[PDB]
Amino acid sequence: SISISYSTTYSGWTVADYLADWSAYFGDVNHRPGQVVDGSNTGGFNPGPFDGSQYALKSTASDAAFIAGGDLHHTLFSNPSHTLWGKLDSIALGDTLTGGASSGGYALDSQEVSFSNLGLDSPIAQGRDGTVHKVVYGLMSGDSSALQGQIDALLKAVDPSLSINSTFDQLAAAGVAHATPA
Numbered sequence: 001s002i003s004i005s006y007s008t009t010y011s012g013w014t015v016a017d018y019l020a021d022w023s024a025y026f027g028d029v030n031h032r033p034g035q036v037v038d039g040s041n042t043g044g045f046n047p048g049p050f051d052g053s054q055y056a057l058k059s060t061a062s063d064a065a066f067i068a069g070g071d072l073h074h075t076l077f078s079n080p081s082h083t084l085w086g087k088l089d090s091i092a093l094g095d096t097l098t099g100g101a102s103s104g105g106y107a108l109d110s111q112e113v114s115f116s117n118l119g120l121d122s123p124i125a126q127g128r129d130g131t132v133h134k135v136v137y138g139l140m141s142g143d144s145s146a147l148q149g150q151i152d153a154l155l156k157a158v159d160p161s162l163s164i165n166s167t168f169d170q171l172a173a174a175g176v177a178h179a180t181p182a
């Protein structure tokens, strides 16, 4: 089942409110045709260059950042082009991205919330319609809607009374979330 980690700072927030606010602040990195600048709005893979166990991206305007973890593959110019696919196990949100391929991995200096055991598996043939792609490209674009939808389904599968409209404290009482120090 989904497992959620959250700083006690967010104990009284709903998941939906936290994610809406986090993504709005992160913003859109404008990873779109004509606007991609390597080292500015591409993010990076570990070990990379275009595959690995992590993909991480910091905002173009502040130190907010996220890390996607799993077994990830990116097609770049190969068909179907510009698709992230593979197995997505986790999304960690916070600020101050540390590490990189030269460090052996990425980590957030201030991890606010993480969602693990996501169990999302997207074949390459689904291209940009795959869930893995939509979740991560959404986050790159400042839009947590796809992530919210996947969390909501995982929470309902535990119990239909649980949803993205539950608070982190409610999800902890329900056995799917645990707090970390502020």
Ligand code: HEM
Residues within 6 Å of the ligand: 031, 032, 033, 034, 035, 036, 038, 042, 043, 044, 045, 049, 050, 055, 074, 082, 083, 084, 128, 133, 136, 137, 140
């Ligand atoms: C090392 C990481 C990455 C690099 C170097 C990279 C590079 C690029 C480049 C060069 C373009 C084309 C810009 C243009 O046509 O002018 C592009 C577009 C795009 N990339 Fe990436 N990308 C990276 C990561 C990702 C990831 C992780 C995703 C998805 C989760 C993604 C999804 C897309 C999409 C959807 C487009 C737009 C394609 C279109 O509308 O034609 N990219 N990227």
